[PDB]
Amino acid sequence: SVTQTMKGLDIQKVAGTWYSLAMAASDISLLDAQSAPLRVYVEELKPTPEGDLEILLQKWENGECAQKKIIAEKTKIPAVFKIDALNENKVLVLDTDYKKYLLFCMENSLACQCLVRTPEVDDEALEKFDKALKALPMHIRLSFNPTQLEEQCHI
Amino acid sequence: SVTQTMKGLDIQKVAGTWYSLAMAASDISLLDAQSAPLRVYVEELKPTPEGDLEILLQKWENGECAQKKIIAEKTKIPAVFKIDALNENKVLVLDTDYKKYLLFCMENSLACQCLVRTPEVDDEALEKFDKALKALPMHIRLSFNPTQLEEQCHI
Numbered sequence: 001s002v003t004q005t006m007k008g009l010d011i012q013k014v015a016g017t018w019y020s021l022a023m024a025a026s027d028i029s030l031l032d033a034q035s036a037p038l039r040v041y042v043e044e045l046k047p048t049p050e051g052d053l054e055i056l057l058q059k060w061e062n063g064e065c066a067q068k069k070i071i072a073e074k075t076k077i078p079a080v081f082k083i084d085a086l087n088e089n090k091v092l093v094l095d096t097d098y099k100k101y102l103l104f105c106m107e108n109s110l111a112c113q114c115l116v117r118t119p120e121v122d123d124e125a126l127e128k129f130d131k132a133l134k135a136l137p138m139h140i141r142l143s144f145n146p147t148q149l150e151e152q153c154h155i
Numbered sequence: 156s157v158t159q160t161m162k163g164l165d166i167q168k169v170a171g172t173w174y175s176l177a178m179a180a181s182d183i184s185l186l187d188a189q190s191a192p193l194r195v196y197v198e199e200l201k202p203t204p205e206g207d208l209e210i211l212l213q214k215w216e217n218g219e220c221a222q223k224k225i226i227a228e229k230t231k232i233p234a235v236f237k238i239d240a241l242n243e244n245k246v247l248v249l250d251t252d253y254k255k256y257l258l259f260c261m262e263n264s265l266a267c268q269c270l271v272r273t274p275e276v277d278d279e280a281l282e283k284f285d286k287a288l289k290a291l292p293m294h295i296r297l298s299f300n301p302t303q304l305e306e307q308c309h310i
Binding site: 028032033034139140141142143144145 | 183187189294295296297299300
């Protein structure tokens, strides 16, 4: 499970543009294919006034790159959000400096991402990402180059 | 490119049973799918008397797990072998202790593996694997659990 949350998270400050620089998952099948279920590209985070988090992303679905808008509801823990599905799905913010990177996980089993503000490889962010994962039973990891980060569904 | 070879490699001593515990590649497409091109499961290494290396592996091809036998020809460098294809493909042995692990890469762009003798997670081997990769521009990494390592094509 995930025992890394961001202490003192200010959700309003994660607002705006992000790039899914790297992804990792507990199970290969969660990320292997273009259309793999947990292989979603974040576009924008929109905290609500009420402190919920609207997430704009892209998902490759039926041989094309589709826009998806989901809402993750706030909990009593600032760094933990709940998504509505057939399963009780949790979004955990592990760490962020707001201005460059944000690490998060979705768990039921588990997929995590390293988000960055700009379409650049941020070695410092990937370092924190790898450190946060050494805690977790991941079996697949992906990363994207600057050229892919500027394309729909990272093609 | 790969600037990690095993100094003093004794090819006769890599003979026998291996498990593709982890794989990494320069490009997501080389490993993403079951049928991805560089996603081959090593079964056995058979050095020839003449010092060539026969490799027995499995490849998921046309919705099933197929046996494949390839030969990599020795070069003047003990730790480097050449495979016959439309492209000049090179096998480089990075490191081995013969008794537990062997790391190798195939390059044209690049796929590497962490081989182990037994169907167990060897953290020491994965450590050496990650260290060897920090040199290389990998964008996908996979690992297999003991249950998968005992199945045809790691299903």
